[PDB]
Amino acid sequence: GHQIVHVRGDSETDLEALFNAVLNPKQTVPLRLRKLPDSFFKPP
Amino acid sequence: GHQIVHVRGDSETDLEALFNAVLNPQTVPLRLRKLPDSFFKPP
Amino acid sequence: AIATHKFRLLEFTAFMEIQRDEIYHRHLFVQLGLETVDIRQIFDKFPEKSGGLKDLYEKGPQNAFYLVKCWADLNTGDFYGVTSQYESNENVVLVCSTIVCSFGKQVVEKVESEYSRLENNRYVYRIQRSPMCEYMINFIQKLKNLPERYMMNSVLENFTILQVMRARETQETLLCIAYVFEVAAQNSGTTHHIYRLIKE
Amino acid sequence: RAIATHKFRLLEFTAFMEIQRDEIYHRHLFVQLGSDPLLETVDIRQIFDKFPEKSGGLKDLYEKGPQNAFYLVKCWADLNTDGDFYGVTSQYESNENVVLVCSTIVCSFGKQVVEKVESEYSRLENNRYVYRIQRSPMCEYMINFIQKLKNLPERYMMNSVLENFTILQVMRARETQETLLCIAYVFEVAAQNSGTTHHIYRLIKE
């Protein structure tokens, strides 16, 4: 078709890690603690 | 998912033109170009 | 608008389609088509090796860089995809690279390209129904299986997408869009804010 | 391996078709590259008009270089198939970890009619970076061309039709856009009792 897709070899374990960062934690700074406009946290 | 393919809009008429160049006819045939003898002889 | 003097995004629609007998349904996750954000505030949420967001921003043009904060609508499949449309005043071969990132690192890269069509004295490009990768489909399904929106937003804190649109012949950056998401409230559709990325 | 520079090389290039009926599988090889002979040379000016000559065409690619990365392959494609899938499997090796980009340009009358772009990340194997393009599907133009050539009653008509057909394969490193390898292909059809064979030539500008 019109697409090339390169998937990292451990993509399934990486997706599980996104969830386990919250559900089973073991450090990224949340956007709410960075310098951003007030609108960033308020949906239109 | 593993390739990008860009097909010219007139690809079907272009394929018909490849055949009609012979069946219903300027490109220089390879036999008239400066090439080694092996070019025309399968190993 | 997500645009420079020479190139512009006309539409970006991420969706899922379902057909069951004589009933068709299309659900929109995201639909595009300004305030500023200091790009130094988002560098660690994207790959920062060669060809990363910082590298791309330094090379420029700086006016081609945008950040989109989107509230994706998960209140809802046969096909998950994205349809986008662009315009240019120059005849380029458009190359769109989409990098799905978790913890600031690439986990999926999608590369697509489109040749131009001259329409009303402008060059139009349309990436029609680009299939979503399995990582994205499973991510949407797993986020939807969480009982509460607060857990979905917490999981999304470590997820970003970067899109880099280039002209094939020169490799110049035509447009670059960073995406950050939250999930839309139950009684709301998808909404977003668009920000220009600058240095302060 | 013949089709090589001191940093990048083609290990295999197999174009084929397969059929499966009742779990019985059969594969047919159209083309297969990879006491091998010393290579002969061809003056590239003798083939410029059989490939695109606009910006980024064969002449511009050759001038940019490296000139030692350019090869011409004369193939006798085996069309005696006596398909469910038509594809090409290739393998390459490099001493540098590049993102390999392979562009295949199907040409008729020296002009592009189909372009296929593929890319592969490496695997480090035996201290080298190996790239594999596995079962790349042939475009519909190529499938229909093979079928229509096979429907011609004689091999002489097939070879005459092939006089205006070429394929150009350009291998690049994604980050630098450098040409790693460039292979021009010219075909004839193999004789009825023969399999696919080929000659490989270095391209020079004398």
Swiss-Prot record, chain B:
Describe the effect of R33A.
Complete loss of interaction with TEAD1
UniProt feature coiled coil, ranges:
30-43
Q: What fragment of the whole protein does this chain represent?
A: 51 to 99 of 504
Query: Which tissues does the record link to its expression?
Result: Increased expression seen in some liver and prostate cancers. Isoforms lacking the transactivation domain found in striatal neurons of patients with Huntington disease (at protein level).
N6-lactoyllysine-modified residues are: K34
Please state what the protein is called. Answer: Transcriptional coactivator YAP1
- What are the subcellular locations of this protein? Cytoplasm; Nucleus; Cell junction, Tight junction; Cell membrane
**Similarity field:** Belongs to the YAP1 family.
What's noted about domains in the record?
A: The first coiled-coil region mediates most of the interaction with TEAD transcription factors.
Q: What does this protein do?
A: Transcriptional regulator with dual roles as a coactivator and corepressor. Critical downstream regulatory target in the Hippo signaling pathway, crucial for organ size control and tumor suppression by restricting proliferation and promoting apoptosis. The Hippo signaling pathway core involves a kinase cascade featuring STK3/MST2 and STK4/MST1, along with its regulatory partner SAV1, which phosphorylates and activates LATS1/2 in complex with their regulatory protein, MOB1. This activation leads to the phosphorylation and inactivation of the YAP1 oncoprotein and WWTR1/TAZ.
- Taxon lineage: Eukaryota, Metazoa, Chordata, Craniata, Vertebrata
Q: How does it assemble?
A: Part of a complex when phosphorylated that contains DSG3, PKP1, YAP1 and YWHAG; the complex is required for localization of DSG3 and YAP1 to the cell membrane in keratinocytes. Binds to the SH3 domain of the YES kinase. Binds to WBP1 and WBP2. Binds, in vitro, through the WW1 domain, to neural isoforms of ENAH that contain the PPSY motif. The phosphorylated form interacts with YWHAB. Interacts (via WW domains) with LATS1 (via PPxY motif 2). Interacts with LATS2. Interacts with TEAD1, TEAD2, TEAD3 and TEAD4. Interacts with TP73. Interacts with RUNX1. Interacts with HCK.
Tell me how the protein is altered or processed after translation. Phosphorylated by LATS1 and LATS2; leading to cytoplasmic translocation and inactivation. Phosphorylated by ABL1; leading to YAP1 stabilization, enhanced interaction with TP73 and recruitment onto proapoptotic genes; in response to DNA damage. Lactylation by AARS1 promotes nuclear localization and stabilization of YAP1, leading to increased Hippo signaling pathway. Delactylated by SIRT1.
Residues modified as Phosphoserine are: S11
Curated annotation (Swiss-Prot), chain C:
Q: In which tissues is it expressed?
A: Subset of neuroblasts in the central nervous system and in the peripheral sense organs of the embryo. Expressed in the developing wing primordia initially along the D/V wing boundary, and by the late third larval instar, maximal expression is seen in cells at the D/V wing disk boundary. Less expression in cells located farther from this boundary. Also expressed in wing progenitor cells.
* Any GO MF annotation of the entry: RNA polymerase II cis-regulatory region sequence-specific DNA binding
Keywords in UniProt for this one? Activator, Cell cycle, Developmental protein, Differentiation, DNA-binding, Metal-binding, Nucleus, Transcription, Transcription regulation, Zinc, Zinc-finger
Tell me which GO cellular component terms the UniProt record holds.
Answer: nucleoplasm; nucleus; RNA polymerase II transcription regulator complex; transcription regulator complex
Biological process terms from the Gene Ontology for this record are:
cardiac muscle cell development; compound eye morphogenesis; embryonic organ development; hippo signaling; imaginal disc-derived leg morphogenesis; imaginal disc-derived wing morphogenesis; negative regulation of DNA-templated transcription; negative regulation of neuroblast proliferation
Compartments it resides in: Nucleus
What's the stated role of this polypeptide? Transcription factor which plays a key role in the Hippo/SWH (Sav/Wts/Hpo) signaling pathway, a signaling pathway that plays a pivotal role in organ size control and tumor suppression by restricting proliferation and promoting apoptosis. The core of this pathway is composed of a kinase cascade wherein Hippo (Hpo), in complex with its regulatory protein Salvador (Sav), phosphorylates and activates Warts (Wts) in complex with its regulatory protein Mats, which in turn phosphorylates and inactivates the Yorkie (Yki) oncoprotein.
Q: What name has this protein been given in UniProt?
A: Protein scalloped
UniProt organism field: Drosophila melanogaster (Fruit fly)
Per the UniProt record, the lineage of the source organism begins with:
Eukaryota, Metazoa, Ecdysozoa, Arthropoda, Hexapoda
